[PDB]
Design a protein around this nucleic acid. Structure first.
Lengths: 166, 461, 377, 103, 482
RNA sequence: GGAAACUCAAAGAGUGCUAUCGGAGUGCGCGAGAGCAUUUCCG
């Protein structure tokens, strides 16, 4: 039960449908935890289903500050309201593999029908999508990740220090 | 005059660019594919040899084990990777098998722990908070049945009530439990079987035949309101909570240790007793054990069905576990290791690929059921190859040389010698039975599937 | 392989296509080897959307040829067999496979959407909703997606609740483009005009003012101002007084350049309480933001607001005698503003004289009057 | 039900009716409350005067010389200005009437 | 319509009745969905038709067929004419890519022929009888003077064979990686070319082997002696598996269809026989041919070819069961119910030495005194090869892949009976009603063992005696019971 | 002895490449179908 995953990236928010599942009981084995490393089996496991880029630089800094304190924001709430289906109470409620237990209650407060999850399965699935990086996104962007994360890092650092630029 | 000649044309066969894939043109003629049966036979023989090459069943321990050998193991039923083990010096533990570590431990009782199971216990004055904490309960022989919460990071919804939610206490001792999986009811066994629910400190009902102790119980997996048990009058009893009464009772020739229902038939169960064969009974006609799995050398200490509904795991008092199929009656295959002694509790996991065995040395080992199917998600041509040559092995399993390759194991020398002398004893007693039947005239051909039953209340209908 | 699997799945259509006599074995082997090469090129290692496009062109042209040989040989239109829907089923499979293997090309996405909108008579709008929702998921930013299938949902099915729903979803998704706000106001006015025309059709066979458009105009103004400011000042809130004030003047200029476009393609729309919502626009642009710009910068903007507030009436009539009849209001407000301005008075005089010159008997004498006499006599 | 469970040829183990729900389309509001301030203001305007198919059916429950050529623009205007649910119910009712009068 | 080519030639228990219905339904469905593949078959075969009555099909020669044929096939129509070494001999590879030619003086050349890539030429100074490829371009065997050699792809002498005391008929069983030798001494020996082991040495006991062919369908070897006996062998039994009386005197050639059903055999008494194999019925004889045809070969479509030395004669569709497709030599009396030669070529003065059809193209290679010549023949090549086994468009990578896969799927040498569908059965102990047991001091040790053995013998005798016991006038009537 | 690799062959390593009856209606399932199946408009 991991069927949707949320990844946050310094160009935009991504949401991945989990096509099939990872082996839960044998999830410390070598022949399972090399599949996260190689690429020909990870795209058997995770496909991209939504990627909304925040385009303003200051809105990227604001999303990064709201994630870094563990709070929902406009673009994140917008794409989860778009992508996450209303799982009706006859079947279940939907599950969402997010990266941190500090963020968890703040999406459970806003969406009732979602259910966040971060065990080591969500941890290493997000680790796999972080490792493979751009090759998952199959061209739904304009701009690489490292220069954008350089700018976002310098801005987040100065906004934390409140460094006097006079 | 009209002539023609075939045109290879070198463009629809070899490509135009470099990167695209060349054609594999195809003609399915039995002219051009001459040896059908011998070639798929040799593919079956290579399948058997490669299965023996990849027969690597053992996957891991979990933790550093318990203190002094386990005696009860309870898989949960909602989630997959959570498994409770209770062991001899009153120690219960609740393992997350993903990282293969323990959530919490408890000095649960004083004497031997006897049986535990997990529940999603619906209280009436409280919402079931079963997506943030998980509940297991455990009965021992010092007259206590404790129900415990467990903090568990399966989810991350919330942010504290760690252990010992409550303690039911009984008159006599307790020998086993299992939880009715609906409406928060659980049954125990001891001097006589009792039925509690978690809103009372006193037993709601008492359901014995006579004053005879009851070694083990089990509920169903569907049609939940009936259950079965086994007592040391060598007896199998059934009960029905809808009538709130016992309902039938057979008596075998030796004491049944562990019973287990089928989670796909709902009226078949397996039964593991001290004579070295796990019987497999149909409920609504308890005169004939409609199968008998007959390959051990010592007492059959536990059995369980896989949730796919056709494989049996068993674990013997001799230091070995076996996996059977339902439809055969002999052993598919066998696990053993030098460092396990006296496997007392075996359970399939809900993934139906991993059997959790628990020895008396202290460890709770794990094994792959299929000892060669790996667990990674495989590419489609590889899955086609595996299912194809597995179907070839299944179709050709009666050929003698691939039978004598697919059959043999390294059975340990104790089990091999003792099964050899048991086989020569059984051949000798069959020879003396043939002599006695050569003489006498009123001698019934006693069926093997009814050999062990020596009495049934409600005799025939 | 899987190319063998797709080719083997397309065999029963050629089976009944030869079983009925409209394709003999030679040419059906010709089209099958051509489809074999096309399909291996499709499922190569590193294929292209050009290959998908021309394979689709091959399948559409063999469908046209199959219909032509059906109306020529068998002289019936629909053969009620497997041979009819099979090619459209294959074209649906190829478009789905292409949108899976290559999701960033809106040319191919649009060709799929146009093909499915054409075949809506055979396969209805649920497939349209499915592929359009997955297009919206894979491209939330590109506003032309929302605009295009909002136009579809309004002009093909006219379901106004879902139309306003997807406009509000897209406007939540990117409230920093001007085009989406402006075309949402355009759709909202189209709906209110169709509703008032329904009321007029009721009156023919014998409350709901533009407050929707005005509220979304107000949220447009403040949100586009804030997000233009955050499009500038990239990461660090620039902190010096004259720079902050001059960028507030810059965003006032860009925001009023959007509001004048609203006035333009609302005056093209009008047919309603046009002076009511235009005066709501100008009451907002009287009660300014960040600077209160009437005595501050952009005095030419203040002159343009005065010019619109004066010439609010004159922009509607070909019978200019009514303009001369009510021009006492226009010239009265004109004198009320000339009494307040000095050199903007002179530019406003040139503007009003040019307006009256673009415009051009008893009222033309009594209630400038020189042009009124020159147009009356 | 267990008897025909052992006669079937391949058992795909999602046996029961699983969680098979369609994804949250952009056309349908999910939790039926205004999220943004724009939804707040537009619904607090449209609380009073909305054509929630009642006035649509009341003003479109009308539609012979007018059927032939007399109302050749009036019928076009009515069928054009008919809304979605009114047009679907009109198509279903007219199709059922033609099914009754032409079999 | 085509299911005869794809065909593969009442109970009590209800679950077994349902299982039998499932398996023969799956048989029918898989045969139909295999027969529906030749719609997707890539191209069609070739033909030359008479299209008149005066335009006979055998008054057509190489000039006009090479004129109206394709340029690529016309340039495939080679003539590698060599004169300084003797009467040549052909063997194309298993796929139609490489060619191996052999002169009787000393010449052995293994070479591509659709490309000019001569990859292993070697002269010797001893009479090279015949030659054949092993699996690839890589290894090719030559039956030389008195030791068979096998050679690498460039020409290094890989192995002399210590056995095979001489050799004049040598070929290959491909899926088993077997090399089969028949010589002028009365031997036939099998040598596996993967493990290197000899497998069997079958003493023939019927004189020198005059000719030999290979069945492709069950990998039996067809010898033909000087007795007129066509024997069929395999390394299971040291005796011949079956024998046949084909012709009188010796039989100079014998050739098997690739579907294993039909055998053509030409003797030395000016006689040809056509045989069924799976029923061993002499289908029809052919007499009156002028010279004893020294070499016959058979196409992949049923288009056989006699080779009478100067003449080569190709008959199309002369393997049916009727009496109409008997291959005759001339239409007499206005009889359209004959089978004339489908075509024929007449070389100048050089005796043709051996035939061989090119596998997957429309041409018949023939080797003679002055060298090689290929003949463009429209229907005598299988058009649509199957790429999982044979492939005329190999690379190095897939060639090595097919090497490792076939070496992994080497069928063991015991598995070649008269009928290779017979390895799945029960072993002639069927019991259709199966009786499943339900319905029936060292001197002193030896002496006690003899005692226990004698007691077991007596108990066995008494049980059999009891089994036989259980399974089985006036004055004497008065004088009974005494 | 230096090697032009552009003559070709046999091989060894490193790198990159893909997925698993037709629209409604009609007895129908909790604004709603993912399916059970037709004589209802039918095509």
């Amino acid at each position: 039960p991991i069927e949707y995953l949320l990844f946050e990236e310094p160009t935009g928010y991504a949401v991945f449908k989990v096509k099939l599942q990872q082996d839960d009981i044998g999830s410390r084995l070598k022949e399972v935890q090399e599949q996260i490393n190689d690429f020909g089996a990870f795209t058997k496991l995770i496909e991209l289903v939504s990627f909304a880029p925040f385009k303003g630089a200051a809105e990227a800094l604001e999303n990064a500050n709201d994630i870094s304190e563990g709070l929902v924001s406009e673009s994140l709430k917008a794409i989860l309201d778009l992508n996450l289906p209303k799982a009706s109470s006859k079947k279940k409620n939907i599950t969402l593999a997010i990266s941190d237990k500090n963020l968890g209650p703040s999406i459970k407060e806003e969406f009732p029908y979602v259910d966040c999850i971060s065990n080591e399965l969500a941890q290493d699935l997000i680790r796999g999508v972080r490792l493979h990086g751009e090759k998952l996104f199959k061209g739904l962007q304009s701009g690489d990740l490292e220069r954008a994360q350089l700018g976002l890092g310098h801005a987040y650092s100065r906004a934390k220090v409140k460094f006097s630029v006079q | 005059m009209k002539i023609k000649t075939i045109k290879r044309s070198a463009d629809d066969y070899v490509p135009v660019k470099s990167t695209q894939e060349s054609q594999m043109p195809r003609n399915l003629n039995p002219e051009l594919h001459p040896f059908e049966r011998a070639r798929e036979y040799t593919k079956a023989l290579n399948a058997t040899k490669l299965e023996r090459m990849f027969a690597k069943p053992f996957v891991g321990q979990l933790g550093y084990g318990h203190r002094d050998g386990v005696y009860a193991i309870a898989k949960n039923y909602g989630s997959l990777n959570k498994l409770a083990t209770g062991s001899a010096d009153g120690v219960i533990k609740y393992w997350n098998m993903s990282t293969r570590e323990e959530f919490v431990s408890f000095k649960a009782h004083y004497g031997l722990v006897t049986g535990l199971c997990v529940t999603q216990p619906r209280f009436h004055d409280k919402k079931p908070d079963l997506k943030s904490q998980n509940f297991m309960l455990s009965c021992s022989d010092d007259k206590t049945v404790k129900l415990w919460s467990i903090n568990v990071d399966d989810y991350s919804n919330k942010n504290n009530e760690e252990g010992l939610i409550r303690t039911f206490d009984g008159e006599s001792a307790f020998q086993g439990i299992d939880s009715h999986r609906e409406n928060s009811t659980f049954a125990t066994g001891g001097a006589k079987i009792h039925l509690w629910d978690v809103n009372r400190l006193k037993p709601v009902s008492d359901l014995s035949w006579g004053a005879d102790n009851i070694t083990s119980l089990k509920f169903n997996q569907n049609e939940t309101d009936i259950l079965a048990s086994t007592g040391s009058d060598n007896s199998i009893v059934l009960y029905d909570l809808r009538t709130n009464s016992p309902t039938q009772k057979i008596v075998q020739t030796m004491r049944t240790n562990a019973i287990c229902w089928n989670p796909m038939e709902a009226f078949n169960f397996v039964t593991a007793n001290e004579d070295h064969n796990a019987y497999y009974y149909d409920m609504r006609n308890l005169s004939r054990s409609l199968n008998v799995f007959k390959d051990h050398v010592s007492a059959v200490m536990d059995v369980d069905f896989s949730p796919t509904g056709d494989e049996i795991v068993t674990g013997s008092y001799d230091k070995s576990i076996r996996i059977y199929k339902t439809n055969h009656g002999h052993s598919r295959e066998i696990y053993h290791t030098k460092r396990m002694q006296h496997v007392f509790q075996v359970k399939y996991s809900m993934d139906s690929k991993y059997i959790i065995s628990g020895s008396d040395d202290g460890n709770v080992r794990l094994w792959r059921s299929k000892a060669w199917e790996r667990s990674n998600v495989k590419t489609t041509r590889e899955k086609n190859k595996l299912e194809y040559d597995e179907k070839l092995k299944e179709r050709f399993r009666h050929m003698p040389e691939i039978k004598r390759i697919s059959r043999h194991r390294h059975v340990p020398q104790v089990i091999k010698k003792a099964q050899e002398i048991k086989n020569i004893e059984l051949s000798s007693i069959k020879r003396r039975e043939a002599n006695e039947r050569r003489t006498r005239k009123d001698m019934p051909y006693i069926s093997e599937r009814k050999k062990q039953i020596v009495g049934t209340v409600h005799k025939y209908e | 392989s899987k190319t063998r699997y797709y080719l083997e799945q397309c065999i029963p259509e050629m089976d009944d296509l030869v079983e009925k006599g409209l394709f003999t074995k030679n040419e059906v082997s010709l089209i099958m080897k051509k489809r074999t090469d096309f399909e291996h090129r499709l499922n190569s290692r590193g294929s292209s959307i050009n290959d998908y496009i021309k394979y689709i062109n091959y399948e559409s042209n063999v469908n046209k040829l199959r219909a032509k040989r059906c109306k020529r040989i068998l002289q019936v239109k629909k053969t009620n067999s497997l041979s009819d829907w099979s090619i459209q089923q294959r074209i649906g499979f190829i478009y789905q496979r292409g949108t899976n293997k290559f999701p960033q090309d809106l040319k191919f996405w649009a060709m799929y959407l146009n093909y499915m909108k054409a075949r809506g008579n055979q396969t209805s709008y649920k497939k349209i909703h499915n592929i359009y929702n997955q297009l919206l998921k894979l491209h939330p930013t590109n506003v032309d997606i929302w605009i295009s299938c909002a136009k579809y949902e309004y002009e093909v099915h006219a379901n106004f609740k879902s139309c306003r729903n997807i406009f509000q979803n897209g406007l939540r998704f990117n409230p920093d483009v001007p085009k989406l706000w402006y075309e949402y106001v355009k759709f909202e006015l189209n709906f209110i005009t169709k509703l008032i025309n329904r009321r007029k059709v009721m009156g023919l066979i014998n409350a709901l003012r533009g407050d929707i458009a005005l509220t979304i105009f107000d949220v447009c103004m403040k949100t586009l101002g804030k997000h233009y400011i955050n499009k500038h000042k990239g990461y660090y809130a620039i902190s010096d007084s004259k720079m902050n004030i001059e960028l507030n003047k810059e965003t006032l200029n860009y925001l009023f350049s959007e509001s004048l476009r609203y006035i333009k393609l609302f005056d093209e729309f009008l047919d309603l309480e046009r002076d009511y919502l235009i005066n709501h626009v100008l009451q907002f642009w009287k009660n300014d933001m960040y600077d209160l710009s009437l005595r501050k910068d952009l005095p030419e903007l203040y002159l343009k607001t005065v010019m619109i507030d004066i010439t609010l009436n004159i922009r509607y009539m070909p019978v200019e005698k009514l303009d001369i009849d009510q021009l006492q209001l226009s010239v009265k407000k004109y004198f009320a503003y000339i009494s307040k301005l000095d050199s903007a008075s002179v530019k406003s005089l040139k503007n009003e004289y040019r307006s009256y010159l673009q415009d051009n008997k008893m009222n033309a004498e009594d209630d400038k009057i020189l042009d009124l006499i020159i147009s009356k006599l | 039900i267990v008897q025909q469970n052992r006669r079937a040829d391949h058992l795909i183990f999602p046996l029961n009716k699983p969680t098979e729900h369609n994804h949250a389309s952009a056309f349908t509001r999910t939790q039926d409350v205004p999220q943004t301030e724009l939804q707040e203001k537009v619904d607090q305007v449209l609380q009073e005067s909305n054509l929630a198919n009642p006035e649509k059916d009341s003003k479109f429950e009308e539609l012979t010389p007018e059927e032939m050529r007399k109302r050749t623009t009036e019928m076009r205007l009515m069928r054009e200005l008919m809304f979605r649910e009114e047009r679907k119910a009109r198509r279903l009712k007219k199709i059922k009437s033609k099914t009754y009068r032409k079999i | 319509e085509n299911q005869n080519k794809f065909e593969r030639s009442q109970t009590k228990d209800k679950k077994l009745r349902a299982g039998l219905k499932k398996i023969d339904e799956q048989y029918k469905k898989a045969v139909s969905s295999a027969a529906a593949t030749d719609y997707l078959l890539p191209e069609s075969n070739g033909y030359l038709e008479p299209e008149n009555e005066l335009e006979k099909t055998f008054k057509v020669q190489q000039s006009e067929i090479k004129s109206s044929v394709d340029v690529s096939t016309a340039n495939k129509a080679l003539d590698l004419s060599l004169k300084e070494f003797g009467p040549y001999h052909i063997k194309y590879a298993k796929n139609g890519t490489h060619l191996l030619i052999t002169g009787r003086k000393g010449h052995v050349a293994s070479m591509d022929w659709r490309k000019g890539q001569l990859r292993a030429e070697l002269f010797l100074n001893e009479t090279c009888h015949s030659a054949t490829y092993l699996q690839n371009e890589q290894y090719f065997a030559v039956a030389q003077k008195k030791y068979t050699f096998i050679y690498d792809h460039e020409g290094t002498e890989l192995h002399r064979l210590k056995q095979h005391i001489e050799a004049r008929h040598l070929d290959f069983l491909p899926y088993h990686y077997l090399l089969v030798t028949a010589g002028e001494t009365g031997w036939l020996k099998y040598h596996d070319v993967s493990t290197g082991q000899l497998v069997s040495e079958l003493r023939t006991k019927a004189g020198p082997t005059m000719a030999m062919a290979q069945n492709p369908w069950n990998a039996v070897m067809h010898l033909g002696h000087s007795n007129g006996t066509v024997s069929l062998w395999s390394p299971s039994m040291p005796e011949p598996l079956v024998k046949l009386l084909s012709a009188r005197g010796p039989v100079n050639s014998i050739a098997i269809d690739r579907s294993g059903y039909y055998m053509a055999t030409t003797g030395a008494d000016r006689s040809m026989k056509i045989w069924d194999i799976r029923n061993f019925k002499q289908l029809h004889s052919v007499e009156s041919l002028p010279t004893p045809g020294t070499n016959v070969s058979i196409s992949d479509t049923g288009l056989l070819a006699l080779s009478r030395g100067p003449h080569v004669t190709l008959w199309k569709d002369a393997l049916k069961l009727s009496g109409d497709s008997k291959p005759c030599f001339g239409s007499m009396g206005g009889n359209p119910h004959r089978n004339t030669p489908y075509m024929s070529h007449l070389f100048a003065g050089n005796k043709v030495e051996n035939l061989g059809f090119v596998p997957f193209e429309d041409l018949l290679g023939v080797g003679h005194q002055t060298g090689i010549t290929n003949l463009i023949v429209p229907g005598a090549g299988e058009a649509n090869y199957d790429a999982l086994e044979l492939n005329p468009f190999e690379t190095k990578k897939q060639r090595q892949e097919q090497e490792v896969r076939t070496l992994l799927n080497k069928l063991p040498a015991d598995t070649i009976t008269l009928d290779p569908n017979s390895i799945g059965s029960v072993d002639k102990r069927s019991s259709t009603i199966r009786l499943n047991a339900k319905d029936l001091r060292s001197f002193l040790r030896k002496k006690t063992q003899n005692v226990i053995d004698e007691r077991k013998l007596r108990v066995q005798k008494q049980l059999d005696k009891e089994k036989n016991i259980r399974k089985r006038d006036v004055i004497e009537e008065a004088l009974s019971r005494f």
